[PDB]
Amino acid sequence: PALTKSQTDRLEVLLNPKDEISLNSGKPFRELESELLSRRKKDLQQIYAEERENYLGKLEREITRFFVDRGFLEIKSPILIPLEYIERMGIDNLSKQIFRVDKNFCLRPMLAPNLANYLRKLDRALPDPIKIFEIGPCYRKESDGKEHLEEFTMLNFCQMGSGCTRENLESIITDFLNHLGIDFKIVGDSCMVFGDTLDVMHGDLELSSAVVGPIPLDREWGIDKPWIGAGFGLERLLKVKHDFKNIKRAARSGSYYNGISTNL
Amino acid sequence: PALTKSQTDRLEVLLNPKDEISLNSGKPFRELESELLSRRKKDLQQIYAEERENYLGKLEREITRFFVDRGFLEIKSPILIPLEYIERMGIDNLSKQIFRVDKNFCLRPMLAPNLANYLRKLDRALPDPIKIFEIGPCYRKESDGKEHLEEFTMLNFCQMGSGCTRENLESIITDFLNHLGIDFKIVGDSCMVFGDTLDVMHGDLELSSAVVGPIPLDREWGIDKPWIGAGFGLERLLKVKHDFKNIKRAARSGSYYNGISTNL
Ligand SMILES: Nc1ncnc2c1ncn2[C@@H]1O[C@H](COP(=O)(O)OP(=O)(O)OP(=O)(O)O)[C@@H](O)[C@H]1O
Ligand SMILES: Nc1ncnc2c1ncn2[C@@H]1O[C@H](COP(=O)(O)OP(=O)(O)OP(=O)(O)O)[C@@H](O)[C@H]1O
Ligand SMILES: N[C@@H](CCCCNC(=O)OC[C@@H]1[C@@H]2CCC#CCC[C@@H]21)C(=O)O
Ligand SMILES: N[C@@H](CCCCNC(=O)OC[C@@H]1[C@@H]2CCC#CCC[C@@H]21)C(=O)O
Ligand SMILES: [K+]
Ligand SMILES: [K+]
Ligand SMILES: [K+]
Ligand SMILES: [K+]
Ligand SMILES: [K+]
Ligand SMILES: [K+]
Ligand SMILES: [Mg+2]
Ligand SMILES: [Mg+2]
Ligand SMILES: [Mg+2]
Ligand SMILES: [Mg+2]
Ligand SMILES: [Mg+2]
Ligand SMILES: [Mg+2]
């Protein structure tokens, strides 16, 4: 007969983009579920036998090699940060998205404040230009949606000193996304923290916001040179690469492994 | 003359294990500081020119390759977890160490609960034995000490099914630490969560606690087979490898890069 909402939801959990299965063909739920369970067990068995790498971990390692090889220093900075960094970033109290931790701390919603501190400090020791990047967890309270996670993974690369032009920023973005095989376009947008941005779009999906400094916020962080930077969501990159319907397939999760349901 | 406490503290920040500099030789602070600042700038310039990899990131990648190559599946699970996982792990309220997040959540203090869930789920799809591991951030409130961080990085590997003997557990630990070049011994200890442990010691420094199941806690997590597992702190491994005096040299930080002060 007809599938209930609970039944369709279960089949959607077990369905993957490579499948060609109609959920509403009239085939009974029991047979659709059994077929998809067999395909997903086979998929996980193949990963276990032949690959064994996590998609988020593997992508982080691929991105790390790209930027290290192009002269950027790899940064690993705190995830648990002072709440004061939030007001100083100019987040007047979307401040409602912040996860607070025991009074004076929060989970970082972006990598920029820690990277600003590193640019300032490293400019006292390293030759021009200063090039650094970080990949790691960031946290925002979000409405339920197909493109948002409350725990996600950011890449932010940035440069300070010479070479900090719009054309060089766009060239790095182009080489990076060409390396990953992802088509894109650049559109102007704006945001409360940085002002005008160059948004990197794949269709209607925002992969990145990028910024050409200086901006007035620089003084609050001791930044006094030209700079460029861009932030990318790794789970959004994986969603494009693997054609996932929902970004949850790509997230840190106990519910999916490399986009395969773990409820088998 | 004589160095103040503030002056000695500044020189200790700038000193590295490879140096052979006496702080109390009678040389004036100004010359000791200038010498150490020049050495550390040179050190950071060399990293920027020739390596560019972060010690924590590089060690995570080295460990990941070791375990993937030995048949363990790489896991990346949530860092922000339900507070309920804490009581169910048998942490009666050292429960005082937990960082709480907005009422019903906390920062994970260990990887075991998420890995227990993965062992249970994967046993329905994968062949015996189930071998998995994770590396990532964990969080504990700690007293100030030379061997503790409030934000640290755990490795936990584990196995469920056949082969889950004390001798196989000790053999994996031995191959792993032999790969890293770190000498150790095994001593019995106990802990509130798991009961008897095999503690992996380098001198008086605990590198790991390891456990041979089953244990009574298994029922609360749906675990019903023999299992073995071990948890290691990556910053403690780096402290041994690089002979750091304080584990802070090894931590996620804005204050040190690969053990070199960023306050230059
Ligand atoms: N909640 C989230 N989940 C997953 N990825 C995210 C999330 N928030 C931001 N990102 C990713 O981080 C990048 C940089 O963050 P930025 O602050 O520019 O996001 P944003 O402008 O708020 O994005 P959106 O408008 O889609 O909410 C984004 O372009 C996106 O790729
Ligand atoms: N606060 C911390 N900072 C750095 N590493 C830690 C910390 N807590 C635990 N570890 C590392 O994680 C491993 C497994 O955690 P476990 O719960 O066994 O620690 P523990 O027994 O509390 O250690 P300790 O007795 O030194 O506090 C430890 O053997 C150690 O290598
Ligand atoms: N997450 C962002 C992605 C954009 C990247 C911009 N930031 C950097 O690249 O790093 C340091 C520069 C400069 C220092 C003076 C200040 C300040 C804040 C940091 C900024 C978003 O569009 O939301
Ligand atoms: N951090 C630890 C390191 C010891 C590792 C043991 N844990 C695992 O290896 O993983 C899953 C097994 C089994 C499931 C039934 C239960 C439960 C909790 C998880 C446990 C410490 O000694 O503090
Ligand atoms: K499909
Ligand atoms: K998550
Ligand atoms: K996952
Ligand atoms: K020394
Ligand atoms: K830290
Ligand atoms: K560091
Ligand atoms: Mg947003
Ligand atoms: Mg946007
Ligand atoms: Mg944006
Ligand atoms: Mg302890
Ligand atoms: Mg102990
Ligand atoms: Mg222990």
Cβ contact (<8 Å) for A64 and B74? no
Cβ contact (<8 Å) for A72 and B52? yes
The residue to mutate among B86, B152, B153, having the most atoms of ligand 2 within 8 angstroms of its beta carbon, is B152
Residues B228 and B261 sit within 8 Å (Cβ to Cβ): no
Provide the CATH number for the domain formed by A1-52 in this structure: 1.10.287.540
Output DSSP code: residue A216.
Answer: G
Which amino acid, residue A24?
N
**Ligand 4 atom at minimal distance to the Cα of residue B158:** 9
Q: Mutate which of B61, B63, B100, B252 to test chain A, going by most A C-beta atoms within 10 A?
A: B252
Proximal ligand: closest to the CA of A254: 7
Which amino acid, residue A200?
V
Residues of B in contact with A76 (CB under 8 A): 54, 56-57, 252
How many A from CA of B178 to the centre of ligand 3?
A: 42
Tokens of B27: 């040389």
Tokens of B75: 């896991």
Which amino acid, residue B259?
G
Proximal ligand: closest to the CA of A148: 1
Cβ contact (<8 Å) for A107 and B101? yes
- From the list B45, B122, B137, the residue facing A126 with the nearest CB is B45
Domain ranges of chain B: 1-52, 53-264
Output DSSP code: residue B25.
Answer: S
Q: Buried b / exposed e across B80-115, counting CB within 10 Å, b at 16+?
A: bbeeebbeebebeeeeeebbebeeebbbbbbbbbbb
Spatial distance between the Cα atoms of B149 and B251, rounded to a whole number of angstroms: 8
Resolution (angstroms) stands at 1.6
Tell me the angle at which helices A166-180 and A55-69 cross, rounded to the nearest 10 degrees. Answer: 140
Q: Which of B86, B74, B165, B46 is nearest to A60 (CA)?
A: B74
Cβ contact (<8 Å) for B124 and A57? no
Pocket lining: B152 vs ligand 2, CB cutoff 6 Å: yes
**Residue B202 CB neighbour total at 10 angstroms:** 17
Q: Which residue has the tokens 């597992």?
A: B229
Distances (CA, A) of A198 to A187, A194, A233: 6, 11, 15
Proximal ligand: closest to the CA of A217: 3
Residues of A in contact with B107 (CB under 8 A): 80, 101
**Ligand 3 atom at minimal distance to the Cα of residue A119:** 11
The residue to mutate among A209, A234, A247, having the most atoms of ligand 1 within 8 angstroms of its beta carbon, is A209
Spatial distance between the Cα atoms of B194 and B185, rounded to a whole number of angstroms: 20
Pocket lining: B208 vs ligand 2, CB cutoff 6 Å: yes
Q: Which residue has the tokens 């006496």?
A: B22
Residues of B in contact with A53 (CB under 8 A): 64, 68, 74
**What does the angle CA B137 – CA B111 – CA B125 come to, to the nearest 5 degrees?**
125
Q: Which residue has the tokens 């599938």?
A: A3
Provide the CATH number for the domain formed by B53-264 in this structure: 3.30.930.10
**Ligand 4 atom at minimal distance to the Cα of residue B213:** 13
Q: Which of B173, B223, B225 is nearest to B198 (CA)?
A: B173
- From the list A54, A71, A73, the residue facing B74 with the nearest CB is A54
Write out the DSSP string of B176-220.
Answer: HHHHHT---EEEEEEETTTEEEEEEEETTEEEEEEEES--GGGGG
Long-range CB contacts (within 8 A, 24+) of B82-85? B82/B106, B85/B113
**Residue A69 CB neighbour total at 10 angstroms:** 9
